[PDB]
Structure formats: C-alpha cells, structure tokens
Design an enzyme around this catalytic site. Structure first.
Site, mmCIF file in Angstrom:
data_model
loop_
_atom_site.group_PDB
_atom_site.id
_atom_site.type_symbol
_atom_site.label_atom_id
_atom_site.label_comp_id
_atom_site.label_asym_id
_atom_site.label_seq_id
_atom_site.Cartn_x
_atom_site.Cartn_y
_atom_site.Cartn_z
ATOM 1 N N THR A 23 0.849 -1.211 0.000
ATOM 2 C CA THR A 23 0.000 0.000 0.000
ATOM 3 C C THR A 23 0.870 1.242 0.000
ATOM 4 O O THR A 23 2.004 1.209 0.465
ATOM 5 C CB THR A 23 -0.929 0.021 1.211
ATOM 6 O OG1 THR A 23 -1.747 -1.152 1.207
ATOM 7 C CG2 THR A 23 -1.809 1.233 1.176
ATOM 8 N N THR A 24 0.344 2.335 -0.540
ATOM 9 C CA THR A 24 1.085 3.586 -0.587
ATOM 10 C C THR A 24 0.108 4.747 -0.579
ATOM 11 O O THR A 24 -0.701 4.885 -1.500
ATOM 12 C CB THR A 24 1.969 3.652 -1.820
ATOM 13 O OG1 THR A 24 2.827 2.508 -1.859
ATOM 14 C CG2 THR A 24 2.800 4.885 -1.783
ATOM 15 N N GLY B 54 2.311 3.190 4.308
ATOM 16 C CA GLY B 54 2.352 1.992 3.500
ATOM 17 C C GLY B 54 3.763 1.504 3.264
ATOM 18 O O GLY B 54 4.756 2.131 3.641
ATOM 19 N N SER B 55 3.832 0.345 2.616
ATOM 20 C CA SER B 55 5.120 -0.263 2.319
ATOM 21 C C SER B 55 5.938 0.589 1.363
ATOM 22 O O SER B 55 7.168 0.486 1.341
ATOM 23 C CB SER B 55 4.903 -1.654 1.739
ATOM 24 O OG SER B 55 4.119 -1.591 0.568
ATOM 25 N N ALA C 274 3.724 -4.578 -3.405
ATOM 26 C CA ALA C 274 2.371 -4.499 -2.885
ATOM 27 C C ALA C 274 1.675 -3.199 -3.239
ATOM 28 O O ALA C 274 0.621 -2.901 -2.670
ATOM 29 C CB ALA C 274 2.387 -4.669 -1.371
#
Lengths: 227, 202, 227, 227, 227, 227, 227, 227, 202
Positions: B1-2, B128-129, B168
């Site tokens: 997610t970002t 997020g990642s 992701a």
C-alpha cells in the site's frame, strides 16, 4: 374518569388510556406545521411565531435536519422534542454504519416509535408529549410520515400538526393535488395554513424546507418566503 | 500500500494507489483507500482492510452528526484527537492500521496517526510499504512555494516510483484536492492519464 | 367492583381480573376481520374502512405477512399491534435459524402468547390491547389460530375479530362448509361480513389474502375484489 | 374484609389470605374432571363441553401429556394452565437429563408447587388461578396427585376438580373400590360425573385417558366412549 | 389498630407488629402435636385427624424426617410448611458436607430462623405462617426445639403446638417427669393430648415417632398405637 | 401525628421520627438488666424471670458472650436480638483476622450501630427493636457501652436497660461508687434492681457475669447468687 | 400544606420542600456551638450540657477531629452525626492518598454536601438531620465552613449552630473583630454564647478547641476553661 | 388540580405538568441576573444582595467560571446549583479530552439539559429547582444561552433571570442595541436591573464579568463597579 | 528521545528535542514533547506517543478543574502523586512512558516518574535514550549558584551532545523557563539559534 386517569398502565372499563389521551392534549398547544409531496419531491412548513428581537433567529427554527436527505419538525413539549430529534440523529447513523447507507426511512421512524411505545406500557415513566413529521428521499423516493406519542405510524401524501391541525386537513383534503410543481404546491400550503389561522393573525415569515430527487434539502431564506 | 498527503499555502492534496492483496496474491486491482469524511476533510488508510473500513464509517457518522447539531464543521486537530482516543482505548485489542487526516479550517493541516493513538502534524507524510520511496522524492523536490498543478504532478511522480519498487503497490492513481473555495474534489481519471503521458511514466 | 378494577395482579372475591376483562373492550373498538379454511388452503379478510385520500393505500392494509407462508391481521391498540407483529417476525426467524425451516406454526403462536401472558401476572405493566389472527401453511397443512390479550390459544376452522365478531360467528356457524373451492368460500366470507355490517354502511374494497399448498400468499388487488 | 383483600402478602387479623381464597374461586369456574386408580393402572376423565363446530376437536382436549408415562388435566384460567403444563413438560426433561430416567413423579409435582408458592409470598405478582391433576406410572406404580394455587400437595386414590368437585367426591367417597378392572372403573367414574351434572345437561363425548403397567397412555376415541 | 395492621415493617405507637401477631393466628388453626424427652431419648406425637378413605395414608403423616437422627412436625399453612422442611433437609446436608457430620442441631435450627426473620424486616414479602418442632440426637444427646414465625428459638424438655397448645402445656407442666421409660412417657403424652381434646372427639390413630441413643428413628405402626 | 407515624423516612413538621420513637417502646417491654464498672473489672446483671420448669435453664440466659473478653445482654424483640449478637460475634472475628487481636471494643460496637442506623434512613425496612449492653476488657481496660435502635453510642460507668431502666439509673445515680471491690459492687447492683422491682415481686436467681483484668469472664452459678 | 409535606421529592405549588424545611427543625433541638477566626488561627466552642456523673467525660465531647489540622462539631440527630464524621474522616484520607496531602479543605466539605444532597432528590430515603461546622488550617490559612442538610456551603469569619444560633449571630454580628489574639477572642465567644443562654442557666465547662498556623489542634482542659 | 399535582410523571387532562410548573416557582425566589452581548464580547451581571459582614466576600459571588472562556450564573435552590456547575465543569473537560479543545458551547449546554430532562420523565426523583445562564467565546464567537429545569434551550442576544426577570426583559427589549462598546453596554445593563428593583432598594456592589475575543474573562472589582 | 529538567534558586528550566520515530525511521522532525499543564507547571514525555498524549490531556483537565473550583494552583508534590497513582493502578496493563514534572509553588521542584508510579524529587533529571549523554554534562558543569542565562546555555550544550551521539534524538530545541514573576515562558526559536552560534554548535 377520575378513578382511571392517574396511571398510564391502567385501562378504563371502556378500554381506554386517559393518560395517553391527555398527552395528545399537550401537542395541540404547539405551533402549527404540515408537509406535502409533489413531483419528485416533498417539503415542510411551520407556523413561525414572532418572538422578542432578543432571540437569535437561527435557533427558533423548528425545521431540523436528521441527515442531508431527511428532516423533521415537531410540536409539543419542547424539552422532549429536543431529545427525540437527537435520538433520531443517532438511529440514522446506526444504519449508515450497519448498512453503509440510510437505505430506507421506515427503518428509522420505526426505531423511534419503539422508543415511545416503550414509555406507555411500563409504570414509573410518562410518555412523550410530542408528535413529529418526517420527510426525505430514499431508494423509493419522496416519503412523509408522522408519529403520535404512543408510536402510531402512518404514511401520508400530506399532513399537518399543531393546533390548526384539523382545520388544515379539512382545507387540504379538498384542494390537494398530486405531482405538482414546487412553488405551485407551496402557495397551496401557505393557503391551508392561512385557513386555520385566526382572523386577527397573519403569517410571519414561516419556515419552509423542500427537496428534490438527486439533490439535498434547501432552507431558502425569508426573502423568498415573502413571495 | 502507498498513501501520501501534503500541504500547500491554501490547499491540501492526498493520493493513493488501488491495489489490494488478500491471500498473498493480487486479488483486487481497483480497490479504494481515499475517502471524503467531511466537506473539507479526507482520510487515507493502510493495513487491515476490515479494521479500516469500520473506522471510516464511524468517522463519517461522528462528523455528519456534529455538522447537523452544531451547524459547522469540526476542526482538524479535533478529528485527529478523536481518533487518537478511539484507538488508544483498545491498544491491547487494537486496529492494525496507519492513517492520514487532511483538511481545511482556517488553514491547511495534515496529521499522521498510528495504531496506538499517536497523532502528529506535519507538512507532508506517507504511509504503506511504499512510504520510503515517497519520502525520498519529497525531500528532494518538495517546496512550500509550489502551486497546485505542481503539487499534483509531484505526488504522481512519487507514487509512480513506489509502484516501480514496491510489489504491494500498484494500480491507477486516485487524487483529491481540497480548498475552501471549491471544496473536496476528486480528480477525473482522464486528467491523471494526461499528466502522466505529459511527464513520461508509461 | 371499583375496589378491584385498578391492578392486573388482583383477583376479585368472585375470582376475576377486571383489568383483563377491560383490555378485551379495547379490541371490540377495532375494525372487523375473519379467516376461513377450505380445500388445501386458507384465507383472511379485513373490514377496510375508507379514509382520507391523503393517506398512502399501501400502509392502511392490516393484512401483514410474517413469512411467505404465514400472515396475520390484528384488532385493537394500533400502537401495540405494530409491536407484536414485529415480535412475531422475529420469533419466526429464530426457528428457521434453529431448525432450518419454520416447520410448525404452533411453535410460533406459542412464543407470542407467552410474551403476552407475561404482562398479565406482573405489576407495573399493562397487558396488550389486541387480539390477532394467524394463518399459513406448515408440514401439516392449512392452519388458523387466534390469541387473546392473556395468551389463550385456540385453533379454528374459521373465526372473526373486531366489532362485528359475534355477529359473524353467528352467521358463519350456520352456513360454513369444509373443503370448499377458493372463490366459493370468499363469496361466503364477504357475506358473513356483510351481515355484521350496519345497514347504513356497505363494503369498501376490503382486504383479502389467500394461499394454497405448494404455493405462497397472494394479495390480489381491489380490482378482483369487486367481483 | 375490604381492608385485607387487596394484596397477597397481608394476613387478616384472623390469620388468612383472602387473595389466596379468591384464586380458589376462579378454579370452580372451570370444567369438571377427576381421576381414579385401579388394578395396575390409573386414568382420567374430563367434562367435555360442546362448542361450536368451527373449532378443531384436536385442541379442545384438556387431557395433556407430560410424558408417555405421565399426563395431567387442569381447571381455571386457561391462559395460566397452558403455562404450567409447559413448565411441567420442561421439569420432566430436566430429570431425565439429570438422572437418565423420570424415576419418580413426586420429584416433578414438587418442582411445580415450588413455582406456584413462589407467587404467593412476594408482592407485585398474582398467584396462578388453576389447580391440576397428575397421573402416571413410576418405579413405584400407579400414582395420582393434585395441586392447589399455593402448592398444597396430596396423593389420592381418587379425586375430582372443577365445578362439580364436591358433588363427585361425595358420590365417589361412597362407591369407590380398589383394584378394579379397567372398564369396571370407568363406568363408575362417568357415574360420579353424571351425579354432579345438572339435570338439564347430559354427557357430551367426555375425554378419557388410561394407562397400565408396562405400557403407555391410551387416548381412546369417542367411539369407545359411547360404550 | 386499623392504621398499623397493613405492613410488617411498621411498629405501632405501643411498639408492636400486628402483621406478626396475626401470623401467629394462622398457626392455631393447625392440628395439635407435642414432643417430650425422657431417658436417653425423645419423641413426637401429632393429632391425626381422620380424612376421606380416598387419600393415601402414607402422605397424611405430618411427622417428617430431616435425617435418620432428626425429625420434625409443623402446624399452619401447609403450603409453607412443605417448603421449610425442604429448606431444613438442605441445610442439614450443607453441614455434613462442610463438617463431615451433622455434629449439632442448633447449627441447623438457626439456619431456619434466620430464613424466617428475614421475611419480617423487609417489605414486599409476608412471613411464614407456621411454627415447627425439631427433635433428634446429637453429640450432646436428646434435643428438642421450637420456632415461631419470626425466628424465636427456645429449647424445651417438652412442648406442644397447634390449637390445643395451651391446654397441653397446662396439663403437661403439672404431670411431666424426667428420665422416664419410653412407653411410660407415651401414655403420659396421649393423655395431655386427650386433655386438650374436645369431649365430642377422641383419638384417631395419632402419629408417633421416638428415638434412642445409638439408634435411629422408629415410626411404629398404628397397631402398636392402639396400645 | 397520625399523618407522620407510618414511615421511618418521614420527618414531622417538628422534626421527629415517630417510627423511631415507637421502636423505643418495644424495648421497654423487655426484661431489666444493667452493668457496672469497678476496680479493674466490670460486670452485668439481668432480671431473670421465672418460666415453666419445662424449659432448659441453659438457654433462658440472656447473658451472651461475644468473646472470652467481651459479653452483652439485650432487651426487646427476641427475634432480632438473636441476630445482632450473631452479627457481633462475626464482626469481632473480622478484627482478629484483620488485626490479629480484638485490640479495641469501640471498633466493634461501631460496626453494629452502623448496621442499625442503616435500617433507619432507607424505606422498605423496619429498624431493630432492641437496645444492648456491651462489656469486656481491652488494651485500655474495663469498658461498658450501650446502643439504641438508631445507633446512638455512649460509654458509661454504669447503665441499665429494660423496663425498670429509669428507676435504676435514679437509684444508681445516687449510690454508685468507683473502684469498688467485686462483691461490694454486686450487692449494690441487686439493690438498684430491687428498687425498680414492683413490691409484689422479688428476685428470682438473676444472671450475673463479671470479669477482671488478666482473666476471662466468669458466669458463677445460682448457688453463689443467693449470697 | 398537609398535601405536600409527605415526600422529599415533591415541590409545593409555591416551590418549596417541606420535608427539607422540617429537617432543619431537628437541628434546632441540638446543643449550641460556634466558631471564630482570628490572628493566624481559628477555634470552636460547644454548649456543654451537664449530664449524669455515670457517663465518661471523654465521649460526651462533641468536638471531633477529622485530622490533626481539621476538626468539626455537629448538631441534630446524634445517630446521623456519628456517621458523617466517619464519612469525613474517610474522605480526608482519600485525598492524602490521592494527592499526598490534604491540600485544601473545600475539596473535603464538598465531598460531604454531595453525599447529603444525594439524599434529597431521590425517594425512599430521608435526608440527614444535622448541620455541621468545619475548621482547620490549609495552604491558604485559617478556614471555617458550615453545611445544612441539603448541601448548602458557605464560608464565614464566624458562625453558630444549635438552638441559640440566631441569638448568637445577632450578638456576634455586632461585636466581632478580625485578627484578634487567642484569648481575647475566646472571652468574646463565651459572651455571645452567654447571650443566647436562658437566664436560668449558666455555662458548664464548655468545650473549646483552637489552632494556629504551623501547629496542631489543642483541646485545653476544663481547668483553663474556668478562666 | 389537587389530583394531578403530586407526581412529575402525570399529565393533567389539559396536558400539563404541575410538578414542572412548580419548580419554575422556586427559581423566581432567587436573586436577579442577566447577560448581554455586544461588540466582540459578552458579559454577565448579578443582583448582589448585602449579607452579614461575617461572610467571606469571595464565596458569595454567584458568577462561576466553567473555563477560562466560559462562565455562568444560577438562580434557585442553591444546593442544586452547586451541583450542576460541578457537572458542567466536568462535561467541559470531557470535550477537551475527547476533542482536544472545547470547540463549541452548545456541545456543553446540551450535556446539561439532558441531565435535567432525565429527572422529569422518571418517577422517584424530583427535578432541579434552578435555571442558569451560560456565556463565553467559541470558534463562532460570543454566545449566550439559558436552561430551564426541564432542559429547554434557547440562544439569546440578551436575557435575565431571577425575580425581576420579566421586569428586565421588558426594559431591555426596548433599549437594547447590538455591537456596542463594553462600558456603554454595562451602564445599560445596570439600568434595566435598576428598573426591576423596588424603589425601597438600590444597587449593592453587583457582580460583573465580561470577556472579549482573543482574551479571557475579567472579574473587575467593586471599585470599578461604582463607576 | 531526550528530555531534561533542572532547578535553580528561583526558577525551573525544561527542554527537549523534536524528532519522532515511527516505523523504524524518521517520520517527523518537528514533533512536540514539552507541554504547559498549569500556570507555573510543565511536563515532558518520552516513550509511546499515544499513551503520553492521553495523559497530557487528563492532567490539563484535572489541574484546570482544581484551579477553578479551589481558585489556586495545585502544588507540585501533589501533581506527581496524582500521576503515581494513575499509573500504578494499571501497572499490569500500563503506559509505557517516562515523565518529568517541574514547576513553582513556594519553591522550585522537579520530579521524575516511571511507568509503575515511582516518583522521586531531584535537582536535575533527564529521560530518553539520550539521557546518559546529558547526565555526563551536568555532573561536570552544573552549579546551583548559576543564573538563568547560564542554565539555558547548559541545557543546550547538553542536548546538542546527545544529538551528536544518539540516533533517535534530533531536531530544533524547545526550551521553557518558569518563574513566579513572569510565569511559564517558552523561548522564541531565534533566541535559541542565537545562543547556539554564540557557543559554536552548528
């Protein structure tokens, strides 16, 4: 019956609830208001009563919103009215949280009447001294309801509330028409209101609030009310 | 997610991607992670989807209630404080999420919020990642003196980079803009694709 | 007995419950209705009373469904009727969840009477001012019940409710026949209803709702009602 | 005593409970019934009262089973009777679950009287307006009991209940005999019933239900009743 | 005092509890009984009243066992008596479980009076309309107690209960002797009972139950009673 | 005030509690007793009233021990007295468990009055109809207290209780002396008791119980009482 | 108003609480006392009333300490006074535990009034029949308060309580002076007390208790009181 | 209506709550006060009544702060007023904790009225005998509210409270002006107060408390009050 | 994190840095850890942000309530005692924080407080990962006889050292000064930068 008009939880030999018929007498003391459906919409009106210039004109308004697509107006004990409206504003959010969207109105009006009937069959608590009007748009379309102190629900094409109630339904039961334009119906409403009014009085910048499909409510100002 | 949210002179800008991952593979490509919870307020989410969707429903309610009773919108510092308490109260049976709150009151504001209730205000943030790949772009190109058109192109250059390096993160980019004048505005997809070609990221 | 007609939880020296006999007086104020079995089916009818044109004709209907194979109609305090029907619509789902299928009706009617008798032996609460009719199809077949405010249950081949109750059972106890066709029984029902009616009044698009084995309920429109 | 006949929890200066003596007046309003032991068995009978042909004859029966080896019949407020019988049908299963088999009957009748006496020493609740009969077979053998509204238990070789109670025990106290055959005892029972009956009335297909050791209950049809 | 004889929790200006003095009037309505100690033992007797032949003679017995070394007999409201005896039969087992052996009797009688006094100082509940006798053997030896509706405890060498109570204690206070043989004391007891009896009546196979150290209770049959 | 003598929780216009002044009338019905301090000790005496020879003389004694260093005696409703003494015998053990030793007496008497005042300010419960005396030895030395139905505590060098209360304090307020020998004080006590006695009556083996520092209580027998 | 002087929770048509005005009548029955501030200190005095020589003079003292820097004295129902003082002695420790030091007095007096007002707005409980005085030293300095049965708080430079209350405030409102020496203020106090006294009576070793900053309370003996 | 003025939970046949109209009579007994808005601010004033010199002048002040940006003043039962103000001082902190800053005032006044209406629809509790004024600055700006015993809320540009209420609103409804300077509005306020005053009385160092945006409250001393 | 609070003759001085660390990297640079909870009272925090922000809200309320009801400020020994109980009551579901309390009543006071409720008064203290690098500077340069200007320069020399050796400490320095005369005063940022250049730490 002086012997059977003390407690809510006592039937008279004729099968009645005087403490319930009495609460309906405190409603007729409140201001007058009504509601009418029409072409793809519905509206409300209240018998605005002039007050001292010392009161902010942004709190005297009895037209209260429950959501951007539902409203209401009330008559009777103002102390209790302020409560149910808050109870309604909370029940509505429970649905949006539970179902993601206030999908229906009857799912709301029902949660209220259930709260009011509750105070009618148990002792040690008095009923609510108010009846209300509900209006708004749902998946179905324009709606319009009413609720008496005991929980009696009924859906109408038009209705009134307050002191000039019977006087209005009389007028309105004769001249009401369906699927009308907006302003064409307003001028009809103020008239039925004008009817129940005593000759000595007139109309004093009443409250109005309409709505139409695909839109939200609109509280238009006293300026347009003159018209 | 970002997710990403920045702050300018008289505006706020928030953006996300749409990829979702359940069962350790790409199950959905057009998810949703950017929400409007108020007239001049928005929120992003990252982490467990269920725990996040729930909150978004709680917040939309608490803020629509306030707006109707009090007749005006809640400030932003208070929104973040309300959450901070709603999360710290269950820090031992908690929501596993990371949030951003952005809006307009008298001025723009952006807040980052953790699972335990910690709330901090900042000029820009990301969750997020793919967050770090974004902080690297902002540290190098951000400038408070920028316009709105320049800030939109920036958040796009930033997320487009995380998509190239975080597995992701992916999908089309959703962007929102907030101003006291026009209010919350979600940009059309065509305007995004346009700026992308204009920048050379496809 | 002015000394023993104040509380539900007091017997008279003759062994009676006046507060219970009184609640049965509020039922006789409600509209009239009945129910009849026949060949592989059962039905209901209500004494539809004309009202103002301002009320939506889709809520005046007293014929209420509890499930696609069970229905009911009620007489008395409308505020309480709306409650039990919701209580019934909930008890029915508890069975489907517990047993996978509403296998019997008496397992339902019983859950209700138990809720009503409860409000008869405890103080601080009034009984319910309503009696009901239940109909539907089960594993057995066509059924038909009734419930008084205290919980008295009885299964009938036919029954009435409301104000013209005794007038109907009289007529109906004489001319009723078993295992009849559908319409052949309807024309019989409207007649027994027509009997209890006062001469000054007639029939005003009454409600009807029938059902047959292997099928679901059918609320046929006023159009077919004229016939 | 108009001053001491309002609450169950008040003794009169003479040491009485009028609210308790009153509940015994609501029982004498119910139909008549009795029970008799004999050779390796026991039975019951009820004063079946004719009703409208519109009522299903499979629910008018007051003879109710609690288990395949125990039965009962009741007199008084029908609304409460329906409750205790369900309470009994539940207490019986608690034993089978706890002890693997309804080993005794007194372990059951006791659980009931305890539920009834409970509603006699506490305020805010009225007693039960019913007395019952219990019969069945246990490890011991044929049994037969009775229970008044307060919980008074007594085991009999024979007993009656209803309105013609005293009239029966009179007849029966004179002509009763022990260890009789089945039908020889039935013809005796219908007679004692025939005694308490008013001359203007006769017997209308009464209910009967007998049982014998190593067997189960037998509700034989009205056909054999004529005999 | 018509103004102070309605509630248990109200003292009269003279400092009394009429609702408590009234409960003592319901006891004097019950049958008569007594108890006497003697050489290494103690016993009981009851004024057996003839009843209809239709009642099993194995349940009319008022002599009830609480354990193989303790018994009791009661007078008054039979519905409540059946309850306390069960309460006693349970309190006794609590000791055996707690201490391994019913080591004392006063540890039992006390648990009861505490349950009865409880219903004297709180409103909404009536007292118990019974007094009892307790007898049995403990580590100490032969004991004998009594309990009034409020919890008053007193240990006696002899005592009576019922209607002929005062008549017995009179006779017995004159002719009682300590450390007597068994039958020598019985013939004395039946006599004091014979005293309180009305001339028109006699003795009808009364109940007796004695016990002696190192032994258990003995309910000897009516046969030996004639003697 | 017939209008203000019904409930404990109602003040009269003059600021009184008649239901509280009434409970003090039930105490004056009880036997007489007193208590006196002296040189390194304290004692008690009770107005033993002769009873039937049929009562064991080991339970008539009103002198009750709470611990080997504390005692008490009570007057009034015997049913309630038996309760508080048990309440005291339990409160005393709570201290020994909490502090390892009943270090003070006022820590005990206080736990009681708190239990009695509790039943004075709440409705639905009557007060206790008793006052008590407490005596014993603590770290301080000889003590002596008293408690009225409401919880009023007062520590005395001497005090009386019962019916001849005022008669005793009168005599005793004149002839009492401090730091006296044991028997020298007893002969003084029986005298003040002899004073309040009616001429027609005398003294009938009264109860006495003394104690001295470093020792325990001593209930000396009627033999020494004659002296 | 005989119709509105029964319950605390009922207003009279004039807006009053007679049951509250009555509780203030039970206070005027108590002994007299007062309190006065001065230079860096404050004190108290009580109208010691002579009693029988049989009562220990170490418990008659109404001057009670709540902590080494706070005291109090009370008037009215002695049974309730003993309770609040214990309630105060507990509330004070809650602060020391919560804040490490009784930093203020108003944080204490408040916890009490809240406990008293509680018993004024709820039914089934009577108020407290006492008013109190509080004195002591805090971070601020000398303080002095008072509390009526409902919770009314007021801080004074001087105040009285009891029967001669109004008589004292009269005298004291005229001759009171601030920042006086210790004994100079005492002689003033006994005088205002001497004023309210009836001519037939005098002063009988009254109680006094003063304090000064940086110190603790001092209960000086009757010896110095003569002066 | 002597029959309908006993309980809060009873409507009169005309639909009223006398127990509610009565509580409004206890308010008119309290001192007088008011509040007025103006240019970027708002203020309050109270009818300070002279008292004995013996009372500290730092507690007689009815002007109470709820926060550095909100204040209030009350009229009626002083015992209850002290409670709500504490209830308000607590509700305000709940917001600051929940939202980080008392963002609005109506979110506070509402939490109170909800607490007061609560004591109007349930039995066993009396309402509050007070109305209040609230003032302060929020995100919006200067505010000013009022609350009656039942919870009725209304926002004003000016308002009064106490005994001279109607007399003030009369004067003030005529001479009030918006957006005035500070002192220009004060001299107007004292005047409307001076109006309701009886001729025999004057003004005795009344309380005043104003505030302005970006600032905090200011309780200026009696010195400036003379001006 | 790095907090410090000292004590002089008639003053109290407290200081912190601003760096915050979430997700194991530097997410915020201008956090806040020094708060005014009363007119003559302040507090610092170190540890879990959420658990700390909560407390600061509780304390601000309990002390503003007291001040309004009783009309005067609570002492400092009592503030610390109040916390000590509020933490020990949940020592098994606890707040993971370290606190300092400083203020003025009749004299200056500084208190250190742990997660379990232990409260100790001292002339100077410090919390956070950079605490030891501070104790080394104070043990060598502190002196009760110092002025205010000298004490400000000291807390700066101390934290500037922890920033050079503790990785979780950084940012601009926030300083507060407390006196019965001028009250709680947060120093302007320009005065800090000035003294820094004047000392040679940039």
């Amino acid at each position: 019956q002086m012997a059977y008009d003390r407690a809510i939880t006592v039937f008279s030999p004729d099968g009645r609830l005087f403490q319930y018929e009495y609460a309906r007498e405190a409603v007729k003391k409140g201001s007058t208001a009504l509601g009418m459906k029409f072409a793809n919409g519905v509206l409300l009106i209240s018998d605005k009563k002039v007050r001292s210039r010392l009161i902010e004109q942004n709190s005297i308004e009895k037209i209260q919103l429950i959501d951007d697509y539902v409203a209401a107006v009330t008559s009777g004990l103002v102390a209790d009215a302020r409560v149910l409206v808050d109870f309604a504003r909370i029940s509505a959010q429970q649905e949006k949280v539970t179902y993601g969207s206030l999908v229906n109105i009857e799912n709301l009006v029902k949660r209220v009447a259930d709260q009011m009937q509750q105070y009618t069959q148990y002792g040690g608590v008095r009923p609510y001294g108010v009846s209300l009007i509900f209006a708004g748009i749902d998946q179905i379309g324009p709606r319009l309801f009413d609720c008496d102190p005991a929980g009696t629900i009924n859906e109408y094409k038009a209705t009134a509330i307050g002191s000039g109630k019977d006087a209005v339904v009389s007028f309105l039961e004769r001249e009401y028409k369906e699927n009308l334009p907006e302003k064409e119906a307003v001028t009809l409403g103020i008239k039925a209101l004008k009817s129940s009014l005593e000759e000595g009085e007139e109309l004093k910048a009443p409250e109005i609030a309409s709505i139409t499909v695909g839109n939200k409510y609109r509280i238009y100002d006293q300026e347009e009310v003159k018209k | 997610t970002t997710t990403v949210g920045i702050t300018l002179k008289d505006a706020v800008i928030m953006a996300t991607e749409r990829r979702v991952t359940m069962e350790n593979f790409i199950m959905h490509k057009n998810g949703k992670k950017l929400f409007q919870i108020d007239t001049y307020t928005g929120m992003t989410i990252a982490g467990l989807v269920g725990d996040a969707q729930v909150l978004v429903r709680y917040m939309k309610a608490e803020l629509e209630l306030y707006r109707l009773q009090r007749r005006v919108n809640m400030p932003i510092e208070a929104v973040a404080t309300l959450l901070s308490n709603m999360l710290n109260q269950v820090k031992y049976m908690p929501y596993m999420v990371q949030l951003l709150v952005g809006g307009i009151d008298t001025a723009p504001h952006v807040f980052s919020i953790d699972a335990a209730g910690g709330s901090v205000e900042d000029i820009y943030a990301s969750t997020g990642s793919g967050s770090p790949f974004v902080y690297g772009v902002l540290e190098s190109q951000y400038s408070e003196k920028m316009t709105v058109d320049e800030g939109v192109d920036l958040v796009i250059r930033a997320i487009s980079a995380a998509k190239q390096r975080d597995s992701a993160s992916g999908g089309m980019i959703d962007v929102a803009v907030i101003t006291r004048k026009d209010g919350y505005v979600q940009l059309p997809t065509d305007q995004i694709e346009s700026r992308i070609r204009k920048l050379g990221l496809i």
